[PDB]
Design a protein around this ligand. Structure first.
Ligand SMILES: Cc1cc2nc3c(=O)[nH]c(=O)nc-3n(C[C@H](O)[C@H](O)[C@H](O)COP(=O)(O)OP(=O)(O)OC[C@H]3O[C@@H](n4cnc5c(N)ncnc54)[C@H](O)[C@@H]3O)c2cc1C
Length: 435
């Protein structure tokens, strides 16, 4: 390392895409760098695994060239993408089920989106520059997704389809999710609903998200310690002392790249600013269910919508991954784990009956990101007021403590792309700070 009295120039706490991108950035600047990771693996809220004979993504999955950082890195390393999924759309409204060819359902849904998203260009004309229209964003940031929904002249059917979509975006009940965050997704999709569909659930890395993570790691020169939860971070004038459950490590600068819902799992000295305290106490809105379901039947390429609260089914959305000769692989989301145990095959089979009657579930699994102490929640969509109250102060360095993550990115906050974007600029600021 450069200076005396430290073990490292840079310690990165957390080895998701954000921490790994920051550690590549720091170590390729010639800084002696260590990643401290609490789990037995790198990847964080991305986790490539297996379900039956299928390679699956238990967390973060889909990517697009609307996402500058992850698309840059995909091409950087010569990786390929393939496609997930629609023929028919099934939706619940007033606790009744309808189905129709996809284009007909999209006539109703798109007309609703036309109304729901009409202010997005006014609030985020530069989506990677959150506060370019600070005052207009401030005017609406108090609104939840449900609040804005109740202001619109839509049919109940249109409102029910939006409820499904909005709940799907934030992974929670619509009243918990910032309306402005809904506008952000649309703005990042170039104010075009088909581009939004393509960006958030279509293309995936052929060799898995883990192949990109390892490419980034292998391009750096950083050390790694796995299965090493950090318990204390202590900063003085000259260095940072990081206490873990298996060793003490010092650095001239530390990048805290943990999910914001786990900020209070670490003990900090001096204490952190009110923005970190409040965000870590309030959490972002992402707290739902994601699972993979195997049904014996061939149901084709379906996509389903249902409100977060309905009498028929706990799933806000179910859609075909691919059809097979063992049946259909479905992907299913719910707003609330209390509504369905995604690993209970019988519970799940009953949950699907209103949408795909007679279907037989042979396998069902979802990773529990909510109870995993190293995530405590799913992807990050802010709650009302959080963007304008906390984003900038959340991003800020405090002495020798820097902060990184998709949970605080400027652009595709809540996505793999946001983690890489934020990790790369924070790692560069650290390199600059260390001169
Ligand atoms: C179910 C689900 C599906 C998703 N699907 C998509 C998708 O399709 N497309 C998309 O773009 N994004 C998706 N996302 C979002 C994406 O997965 C995340 O935004 C991203 O992976 C997180 O990057 P990060 O490095 O900022 O955070 P994390 O991956 O959470 O990095 C945090 C890391 O730090 C570690 N850590 C935490 N606390 C400590 C501690 N005290 N000591 C040591 N280590 C610690 C954690 O174990 C973890 O390895 C999804 C998220 C979820 C939950």
């Amino acid at each position: 390392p450069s200076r005396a009295g430290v073990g490292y120039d840079v310690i990165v706490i957390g080895g998701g895409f954000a921490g790994v991108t920051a550690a590549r950035e720091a170590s390729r600047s010639g800084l002696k760098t260590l990643i401290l990771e609490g789990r037995s693996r790198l990847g964080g809220r991305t986790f490539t695994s297996k379900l039956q004979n299928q390679k699956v993504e238990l967390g973060g999955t889909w990517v697009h060239w609307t996402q500058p950082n992850v698309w840059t890195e995909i091409m950087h390393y010569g990786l390929e993408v393939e496609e997930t999924v629609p023929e028919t759309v099934i939706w619940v409204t007033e606790d009744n089920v309808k189905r129709a060819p996809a284009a007909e359902a999209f006539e109703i849904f798109g007309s609703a989106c036309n109304e729901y998203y009409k202010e997005a260009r006014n609030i985020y004309p530069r989506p990677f520059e959150p506060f370019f229209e600070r005052k207009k964003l401030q005017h609406v940031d108090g609104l939840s997704a449900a609040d804005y929904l109740e202001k619109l002249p839509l049919t109940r059917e249109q409102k029910d389809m939006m409820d499904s979509w909005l709940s799907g975006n934030g992974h929670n009940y619509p009243e918990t999710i910032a309306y402005s965050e809904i506008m952000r997704w649309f703005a990042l999709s170039n104010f075009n609903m088909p581009t939004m569909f393509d960006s958030i659930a279509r293309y995936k890395i052929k060799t898995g998200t883990h192949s990109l993570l390892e490419a980034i790691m292998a391009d750096g020169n950083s050390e790694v310690k796995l299965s090493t939860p950090v318990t204390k971070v202590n900063q003085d004038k000259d260095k940072v002392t990081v206490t873990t459950e298996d060793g003490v490590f010092t650095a001239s600068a530390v990048i805290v790249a943990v999910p914001i819902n786990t900020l209070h799992d670490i003990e900090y000295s001096p204490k952190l600013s009110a923005a970190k305290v409040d965000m870590g106490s309030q959490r972002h809105a992402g707290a739902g269910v994601k699972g993979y379901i195997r049904v014996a039947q061939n149901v084709g390429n379906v996509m389903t919508y249902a409100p977060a609260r309905n009498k028929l089914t706990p799933f806000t959305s179910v859609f075909t991954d691919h059809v097979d000769e063992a049946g259909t692989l479905l992907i299913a989301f719910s707003a609330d784990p209390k509504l369905i145990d995604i690993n209970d095959i019988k519970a799940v089979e009953k949950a699907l009956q209103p949408l795909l009657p007679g279907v037989e579930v042979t396998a069902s699994y979802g990773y529990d990101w909510n109870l995993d102490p190293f995530s405590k929640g799913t992807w990050c969509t802010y709650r009302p007021n959080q963007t304008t109250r906390y984003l900038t102060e959340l991003q800020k360095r405090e002495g020798r403590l820097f902060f990184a993550g998709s949970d605080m990115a400027n652009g595709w906050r809540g996505f793999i792309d946001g983690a890489i974007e934020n990790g790369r600029e924070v790692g560069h600021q650290v390199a600059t700070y260390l001169k």
